[PDB]
Design a protein around this ligand. Structure first.
Ligand SMILES: Nc1ccn([C@H]2CC[C@@H](COP(=O)(O)OP(=O)(O)OP(=O)(O)O)O2)c(=O)n1
Ligand SMILES: [Mg+2]
Ligand code: NA
Length: 338
DNA sequence: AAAAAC
DNA sequence: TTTTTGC
DNA sequence: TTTTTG
DNA sequence: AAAAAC
DNA sequence: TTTTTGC
DNA sequence: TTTTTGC
């Protein structure tokens, strides 16, 4: 009955198995850092499936007929039932390598590789990293260290409501017909988020007006001294930012907060695919594509859906129509929290 | 790690 | 040349 | 056994 | 995209 | 996938 | 490196 695919599941933000999901989330993180990619996904899909249950697990008979729960996962579950916690997860949480990875990757511009690079140099604290004269920091790592306290506290719903107003005012100044949609975790009903994700598309605007808007907005914020960081990408068209949000703009110190803002600019003909692809979650995204490939012999990505059998690209003006192409029951954004 | 011959 | 960062 | 896992 | 040299 | 900066 | 399902 319950599917192994997050796209065939309704997952709201009401998790009755947080005890188990937290333990599986730690063990999947440990395997991601130890590069055991296979095992890492296995715990991520088991953690995901339990978030969809409309009740807490209180016995091993409750695990009956749930997919993705094999011999190992059932062991982690069983241990949490008897001793109230996972010995496995506890041993990981206390590991020197795991502790480093988490502290290091919390800095914006530091991933698994640099975290391991710094660990293989004997670094365990951020004070030691910053104190070092010999170390060479990238432009991103510099902003991550500069605005560390603000970026380590997640973005809340009123702060995201305010940032949405900044984007709206900026975008409409250079493209009045443009449509601005808040994507990511906030579209999915979340109250926290590491950043504020946006999707911008213009129906009337030209190609020239399209390949320049993100520059015109980021330069607009630059002039006002709001642009704390910017990294541009062209292909869709993406701009990763760190913005200065003044407390006065938030509808309820230093007077402002540094906030990560992800702005995607897509062509108006691909907005349904971009909206589905940037809403998330990451697990719903991969299970949608895994379903398309293995169950329907189709190819789904952020810009198009191709049917490999009918040898055609499928058109869609809404997310409703994409689920329909794939033979899936429509899952509203707030039921995509896999 | 758990499926799937994915 | 390959690697690293960001979804 | 090997393959896949967005 | 833009560095950094992992 | 194409800049720049160093080793 | 493990177990399951189904040719
Ligand atoms: N590996 C990833 C990461 C992200 N995304 C998509 C889905 C969500 C969207 C925005 O990504 P995030 O910034 O990571 O935001 P979020 O997942 O919604 O959560 P958070 O609140 O932490 O930003 O990009 C994805 O498909 N695959
Ligand atoms: Mg987000
Ligand atoms: Na990081």
């Amino acid at each position: 009955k319950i599917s192994q695919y997050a796209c065939q599941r309704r997952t709201t933000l009401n998790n009755y198995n947080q005890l188990f999901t937290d333990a599986l989330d730690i063990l999947a993180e440990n395997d991601e850092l130890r590069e055991n990619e296979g095992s890492c996904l296995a715990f991520m899909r088991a953690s995901s499936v339990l978030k969809s249950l409309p009740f807490p697990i209180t016995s091993m008979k409750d695990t009956e007929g749930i997919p993705c729960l094999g011999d190992k996962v059932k062991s982690i579950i069983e241990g949490i039932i008897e001793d109230g916690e996972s010995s496995e997860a506890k041993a990981v949480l206390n590991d020197e390598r795991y502790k480093s990875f988490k502290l290091f990757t919390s800095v914006f511009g530091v991933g698994l590789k640099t975290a391991e690079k710094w660990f293989r140099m004997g670094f365990r604290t951020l004070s030691k990293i910053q104190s070092d004269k010999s170390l060479r920091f990238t432009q991103m790592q510099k902003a991550g260290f500069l605005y560390y306290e603000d970026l380590v506290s997640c973005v809340n719903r009123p702060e995201a409501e305010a940032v949405s107003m900044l984007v709206k005012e900026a975008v409409v100044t250079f493209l009045p017909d443009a449509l601005v949609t808040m994507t990511g975790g906030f579209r999915r009903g979340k109250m926290t988020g590491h950043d504020v994700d946006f999707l911008i598309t213009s129906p009337e605007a030209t190609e020239d007006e399209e390949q320049q808007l993100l520059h015109k907005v980021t330069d607009f914020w630059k002039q006002q001294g709001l642009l704390l960081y910017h990294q541009y990408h062209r292909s869709f068209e993406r701009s990763f930012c760190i913005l200065k949000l003044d407390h006065g703009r938030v509808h309820s110190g230093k007077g402002w907060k540094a906030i990560r803002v992800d702005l995607v600019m897509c062509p108006y003909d691909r907005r349904a695919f971009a909206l589905l692809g940037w809403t998330g979650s990451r697990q719903f995204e991969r299970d949608l594509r895994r379903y398309a490939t293995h169950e329907r012999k189709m190819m789904l990505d952020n810009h198009a859906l191709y049917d490999r059998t009918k040898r055609v690209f499928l058109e869609a003006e809404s997310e409703e129509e994409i689920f329909a192409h794939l033979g899936l029951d429509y899952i509203e954004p707030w039921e995509r929290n896999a």
